[PDB]
Write a protein that binds this ligand. Structure first.
Ligand code: HG
Length: 421
């Protein structure tokens, strides 16, 4: 079991795993109630009005601009009951991901993926990077800094814009230099997307109303895979995009999909990135792990009193699977690097999780969303850790009937259609 406490949103704060916290954003903010569901992983059941100064409220953009696939509701996730349900929904989804061998591996890699202590401007000293921590209000009212890897937070204005956010460094590209950084995942367990079972229908923008619902566990896993990349500093620059020439409608609109998203989906999508660049990326991040080992070897003392130099050097030797001689000098073994790189990029994919969940799912990232549904996964009669919607020993166990929004219509309320627009 991944989440040892069944938190209720109204549980009293203790300054340990139920606390009012502040996020290291450049602006001001009122403390927000947060829940530590696992070592290094916190959940904030609030709409993310914090990580991005440009998204400080919940109203859509009124400047003759509006993205087609979007959904707005400024009251969602504003009541204590919604926040309680959000917390239990997210918890349930982590347990579902933890219930599979692949999910356990991913969550283990994510917990191990401590953002690198590269904040020191002096080579002989190892120092944390402040924006990889939160500030936790203690029972005496004072703040203490706590390192963390992952935050699950509510979506911003656009409810169905699920994405990873993280704080940048002035000089460093933390998500693409091997360092990594604390990841804020905007996510909701209260909505899901509809897709079409037929491939030609799913990839056509004019057809389908979204007969089947995506298992939210897959959506979170997709998100967590992205966070794994960025926590290990191997995320592919989103400016590297594949000019889709395999879907006449994508080409018609000149749609480009980032290599990072094709990689995350896996399956055939990941094959659109040809060998020459794949090799280039691998070699690029292999060197970054070399510079990390070269930084560790120069560090002779540590900054602060939270942990010893020896301990932090070992934390990063285990994160990056470095090699260590008797004198403590670290190096990167190409074999072990390729092992970890492939693990994070090819083993952890959305298409692989589909196999472990035994759910129905979009066959490619290169499709067209059909509709968005309101769901409630907290009741065991709706959704279980082990089966998602396809509850065993009911009519929903077979043929993914649980995700069939026409057969299981009581579990889905269609809110918006995207076909045609
Ligand atoms: Hg993400």
């Amino acid at each position: 079991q991944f989440v040892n406490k069944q938190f209720n949103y109204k549980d009293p704060v203790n300054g340990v795993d139920i606390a009012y916290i502040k996020i290291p954003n450049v602006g001001q903010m009122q403390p927000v109630k947060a829940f530590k569901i696992h070592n290094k992983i916190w959940v904030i059941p609030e709409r993310d009005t914090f990580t991005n100064p440009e998204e400080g409220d919940l109203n859509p953009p009124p400047e003759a601009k509006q993205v087609p696939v979007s959904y707005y509701d400024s009251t969602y996730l504003s009541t204590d009951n919604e926040k309680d349900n959000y917390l239990k929904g997210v918890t349930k989804l982590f347990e579902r991901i933890y219930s599979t061998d692949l999910g356990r591996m991913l969550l283990t890699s994510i917990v191990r993926g401590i953002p690198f202590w590269g904040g020191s401007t002096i080579d002989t000293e190892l120092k944390v990077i402040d924006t990889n921590c939160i500030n936790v209000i203690q029972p005496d009212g004072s703040y203490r800094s706590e390192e963390l890897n992952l935050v699950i937070i509510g979506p911003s204005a656009d409810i169905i814009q699920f994405e990873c956010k993280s704080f940048g460094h002035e000089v460093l590209n933390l998500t693409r230099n091997g360092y990594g950084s604390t990841q804020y995942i905007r996510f909701s367990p209260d909505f899901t997307f509809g897709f079409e079972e037929s491939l030609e229908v799913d990839t056509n923008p004019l057809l389908g109303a979204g007969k089947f619902a995506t298992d939210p566990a897959v959506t979170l896993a997709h998100e967590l895979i992205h966070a794994g990349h960025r926590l290990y500093g191997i995320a592919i620059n989103p400016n590297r995009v594949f000019k889709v020439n395999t879907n006449a409608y994508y080409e018609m609109s000149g749609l480009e999909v980032s290599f990072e998203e094709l990689r995350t989906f896996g399956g055939h999508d990941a094959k659109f990135i040809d060998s020459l660049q794949e090799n280039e990326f691998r070699l690029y991040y292999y060197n970054k792990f070399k510079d990390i080992a070269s930084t560790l070897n120069k560090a002779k003392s540590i900054v602060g009193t939270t942990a010893s130099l020896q301990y932090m050097k070992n934390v990063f030797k285990e994160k990056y699977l470095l090699s260590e001689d008797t004198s403590g000098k670290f190096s990167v073994d190409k074999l072990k690097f390729d092992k970890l790189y492939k693990m994070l990029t090819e083993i952890y994919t959305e298409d692989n999780f589909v196999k472990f969940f035994k759910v129905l799912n979009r066959k490619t990232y290169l499709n067209f969303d059909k509709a968005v549904f309101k769901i409630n996964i907290v009741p065991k009669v709706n959704y279980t850790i082990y089966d998602g919607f396809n509850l065993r020993n009911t009519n929903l166990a077979a043929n993914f009937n649980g995700q069939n929004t026409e057969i299981n219509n009581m579990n889905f309320t269609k809110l918006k259609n995207f076909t045609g627009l």
